[PDB]
A and B are shown apart, each in its own frame.
Chain A
Amino acid sequence: MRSVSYVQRVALEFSGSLFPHAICLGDVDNDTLNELVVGDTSGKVSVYKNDDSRPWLTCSCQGMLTCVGVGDVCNKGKNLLVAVSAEGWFHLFDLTPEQRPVFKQHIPANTKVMLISDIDGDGCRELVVGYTDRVVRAFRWEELGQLVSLKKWMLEGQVDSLSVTLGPLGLPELMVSQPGCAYAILLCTWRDVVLHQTRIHNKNVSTHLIGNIKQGHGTESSGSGLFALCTLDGTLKLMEEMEEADKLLWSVQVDHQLFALEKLDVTGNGHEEVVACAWDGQTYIIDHNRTVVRFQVDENIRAFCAGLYACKEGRNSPCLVYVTFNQKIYVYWEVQLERMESTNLVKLLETKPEYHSLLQELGVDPDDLPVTRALLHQTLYHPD
């Protein structure tokens, strides 16, 4: 539908190459303020804070990075920065008051994606890693500290995104994307893979998936139930889990090469919106009612991200992050919208009943559109 043009942005310098999953935003220094973490192939991870054009600080690993994350993996209640290299290493950093890691451990190599969440429901956070050859492995941190393995699943179609979604009955569920606009459910038994199919043209399209999309205010840890999938041939689908079968809320067909999927609350009313980005920089924002908002960045995109960031005045605000080919990262931090649809003023005043009563008292019938137009003009531009 309507297109917009965001203006305010901050450009950050970045010299290196990266995978589309080596970028994240979150609180690494534990100050209730978000910071930006980017992992370069070279073996260095840059953390940006506030709006400096230079990295706030750099931490050097060994090997080439493939996944980065911020989370309370150690279950100590303090967020840590965790990096997974390509050759199977696992580095940890604590940055709450260079930067050699505080803990290393070798794990299986060929890592592709990574997630930190409590999947079983035991109140302790587990770590999930998806590998490049359709193999998913779960781990948990155990104090002597050291990671110990858990169930491992094997799949046929390629693995692109991991998610945790509240199931039909108040329980977390581990979901994985499967090519051809399909997905799989992994059972944390401690068949172990329940495939599901969602129409369709190819069977090798790369698919991406996001889950646990909020639906109201103050009901973040209190529930979930919506998830979304996107296919490289330009198809987005938002659907809800429930018990019997997964009800599909809506589907949208665009003509670009979608390669990322995030969630962000831009309207500020509690509900979260689906954010998708193509390779050429076209970005789509859709709410839970198929109301689309487009935004075109006239460049070519290497990597994408969205979330709360602290850029100005020490405040967390919604932000869109793009990585360009010109050694720059653009952070847009003024993306809030008053609404998503377009309405003028008469339809907005018509909802309120006070306006109806207050005009009925005046003796004017509110069904005569020109008369009300004249009255509104007099009230707005000639207040005396």
Chain B
Amino acid sequence: KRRTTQLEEGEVGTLHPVFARVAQRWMEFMVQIGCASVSRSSAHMVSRFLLPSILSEFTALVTSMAGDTSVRIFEQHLEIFGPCSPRPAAERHLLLLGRNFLQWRRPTQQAAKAMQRFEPGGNAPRQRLLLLEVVDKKLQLLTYNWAPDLGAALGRALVRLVQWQNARAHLIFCLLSQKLGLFHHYGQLDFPNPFLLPTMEVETLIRSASPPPFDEALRDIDPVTYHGQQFLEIKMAERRELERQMKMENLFVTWQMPISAGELETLKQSSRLVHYCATAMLFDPEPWLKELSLAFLQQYVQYLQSIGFVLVPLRPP
């Protein structure tokens, strides 16, 4: 019985014959006659490699708009569905599914405070189900018996998320075109979808997976994460470099001022030690000797200033 309650949880085994053939043909039939039922949203991807992040974000979305749901992904590993890229031209066929398990034990107790419930109560088996289905690049969402606001919001959020991912894919394609050495061939604003306006925030798109120059970046220097995190570090290697290539120029032209110790340290690190000399203090075998040494130091400083050197004032911290 320990595993028998892990078989009716989609954890291990197979998917019932129902959820593989009939309860997508009929939930797509209920909308053709109108009901207080399936909402039938839809969307469309642009490239297959976006699927995993899409499903992760969708799982987060579902566990956010209703905590009672439990996402379960099944994939045809072959007409049989086994629980849970391989070949280039292979077209996957997945089937997401959500259900509030501790309602599938007491189908008549209480769904909610009408919050996540279109039409609950009764005895009546009124329950709900979420059945996003996926073909190679086509994902169709079909809810059932959710609050109308919840269902509409879920559909809109799904569409928005897919658009976000499409924008990221467009950016990646731009970068890939750059890598070949074809710069004015693809173009950032050549085919730019609410997120494809000329005010696109490249860094936010690359660094984030969910919605809230560039055309010659690589000239003469998850695939989205692999390539964007390389582009970002290519870019940051100049904002963190030209600062310490113009600071030196500024100091050079200025001296040709109380600079901080950090600037001096950077100056030493960029300069090569080219000569040295040393001598012995033939007094100490001592504050008196300290004063004599300080007098020696200042006399040498005065001598040096007569040669052309100018003292560098150490700035306060």
Q: List residues of chain A with CB under 8 Å of any chain B CB.
A: 17-19, 41, 86-87, 109-110, 132, 302, 325, 327
Contact = CB atoms under 8 A, between A and B. Distances in A.
B180 interface: no
Interface in B191-245: none
A327 B244 CA distance: 14
Contacts, number: 19
A131 to B, nearest CB: 11
Nearest to B279: A109
From DSSP, what is the main secondary structure of chain A's interface residues?
loop
A325 B276 contact: no
Nearest to A279: B272
Interface residues of B, number: 9
B11 to A, nearest CB: 45
Contacts of A132: 276-277
Contact of B269 (A17, A86, A87, A109): A17
B268 A17 contact: yes
B273 A41 contact: yes
A327 B269 contact: yes
Interface of B: 268-270, 272-273, 276-278, 280
A41 B269 CA distance: 12
B272 A110 contact: no
Contacts of A110: 277-278
Contacts of B270: 325
Contacts of A87: 278
Contacts of A327: 269
Contact of A19 (B269, B273, B277, B280): B273
A125 B278 CA distance: 29
A87 B272 CA distance: 20
A17 B274 CA distance: 11
Shortest beta-carbon contacts, A-B, top 6: A109-B278, A17-B273, A302-B272, A87-B278, A86-B278, A110-B278
B280 A109 contact: yes
Given A110-B277, A132-B277, A325-B270, 10 more contacts: A17-B268, A17-B273, A19-B273, A41-B273, A87-B278, A109-B278, A110-B278, A132-B276, A325-B269, A327-B269
A117 to B, nearest CB: 26
A327 B276 CA distance: 22
